[PDB]
Amino acid sequence: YEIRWRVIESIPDGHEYIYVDPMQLPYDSRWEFPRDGLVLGRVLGSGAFGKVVEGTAYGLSRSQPVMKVAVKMLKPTARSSEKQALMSELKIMTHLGPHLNIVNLLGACTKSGPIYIIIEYCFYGDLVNYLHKNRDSFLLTLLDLLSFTYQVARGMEFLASKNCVHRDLAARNVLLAQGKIVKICDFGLARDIMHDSNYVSKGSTFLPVKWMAPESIFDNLYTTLSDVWSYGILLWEIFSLGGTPYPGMMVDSTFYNKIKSGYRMAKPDHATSEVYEIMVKCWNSEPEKRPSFYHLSEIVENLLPGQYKKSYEKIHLDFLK
Ligand SMILES: Cn1cc(-c2cc3c(N4CCN(c5ncc([C@@](C)(N)c6ccc(F)cc6)cn5)CC4)ncnn3c2)cn1
């Protein structure tokens, strides 16, 4: 190809070194959970082709013989396109490993019918409804907002270390667990970073434009660095207490023109000067200049009381006992 500026730089030293593709890896049978040990209850989120329901699981844990869970599944209206994606989503989760700030996978029903993905249940729901619920009380506290901001930073650091690009980081995809523990969810659009080069076929039809970095919209480039842009948008959501990004702006020619020119959202009412600067660094137009998720945690860690780090580590270690 003759136009070299349109070729993205591609990174393998010798034939001995291969990319471990999680899509190609075997399914550990220990994830399997009999379908007749799962009762399905109320819907937790739904869409045209799928839903997440609350479930009770009997005998999934030795600690909790009757345990509340969530269950990701497809509707009858879903086609084979949605069926292959849910499978690949299960593949990404079985190989990620567990983390304190991820809605962890507990099991799956893969053997007979449609796929069920069984995930831990988060008592408080998503961060957008939670922040709407508490708006009047705030005016929750400010430290809570910082704590949410740190935990997502650690969650994302864990994902990027596994070379996993989330591609839909947003407040609607942050849940709150029993001890005000923040959990990232929805790996439907998640891809390994080497996925787009090795098995090239994509075409998600509807995208979260207002959360996406310029090079993701315009060039279909998804990296950890475009996740960091989304993390900036997530921060704006949290400190506007559940606000809609770019409020009053339709996504159109002029919107894309504005973002490309350097337009950015103004500071939200409940963000400090220092916290707005984090969102600004996150929306740098040159992706390589955005801060890393490790660096972001270190910045946000400074904004929290000194003991928080020690207590957060105590929760974290305990979770993996
Ligand atoms: C009021 N309240 C609510 C909760 C709550 C809510 C969750 C939860 N979520 C629910 C939202 N999610 C979600 N919704 C839709 C999709 C789809 C439509 N795109 C989809 C579904 C299936 C499919 F195969 C493909 C696509 C995906 N995911 C998951 C996270 N998970 C755990 N606990 N929990 C607890 C608690 N109080």
Author numbering: 555 to 565, 567 to 694, 790 to 971
Sentences reproduced from the published study:
Avapritinib is the only potent and selective inhibitor approved for the treatment of D842V-mutant gastrointestinal stromal tumors (GIST), the most common primary mutation of the platelet-derived growth factor receptor α (PDGFRA). Against this background, we solve the crystal structures of avapritinib in complex with wild-type and mutant PDGFRA and stem cell factor receptor (KIT), which provide evidence and understanding of inhibitor binding and lead to the identification of a sub-pocket (Gα-pocket). Furthermore, we report the identification of a sub-pocket (Gα-pocket) located in the N-lobe of the kinase domain, which is surrounded by amino acids of key regulatory elements such as the Gly-rich loop and the αC-helix.
Previously, we found that mutation of the gatekeeper PDGFRA-Thr674 to a non-polar isoleucine (T674I) or a sterically more demanding arginine (T674R) induces resistance to avapritinib. The complex crystal structure of avapritinib bound to PDGFRA-T674I demonstrated, as anticipated by Grunewald et al., that avapritinib binds an active-like kinase conformation, which is characterized by an extended AL and a DFG-in state as was evident from Asp836 (or Asp810 in KIT) of the Asp-Phe-Gly (DFG) motif pointing into the ATP-binding site. Avapritinib interacts with the hinge region via H-bonding with the backbone amine of Cys677 via the pyrrolotriazine scaffold N2 nitrogen. The scaffold further interacts with Leu599, Leu825, Ala625, and Tyr676. The solvent-exposed methyl pyrazole undergoes a cation-π-interaction with Arg597. The linking piperazine forms contacts with Val607 and Cys835, while the pyrimidine interacts with Val607 and forms an additional hydrogen bond with the catalytic Lys627. For the primary amine located at the stereocenter, we observed an ionic interaction between the primary amine and Asp836 from the DFG motif. The binding of avapritinib stabilizes the DFG-in conformation of the kinase domain in which the amino acids Gly605 and Val607 of the Gly-rich loop, Leu641 of the αC-helix, the catalytic Lys627 and Leu629 form a hydrophobic pocket that can perfectly accommodate the shape of the fluorobenzene moiety of the inhibitor. Additional cation-π interactions of the fluorobenzene were observed with the catalytic Lys627. This pocket extends beyond the phosphate-binding region of the ATP-binding site and is distinct from the backpocket (often referred to as the switch or deep pocket in some publications) and has not been targeted or studied previously in the field of KIT and PDGFRA or related kinases; therefore, we refer to this structural feature as the Gα-pocket, to account for its location between the αC-helix and Gly-rich loop.
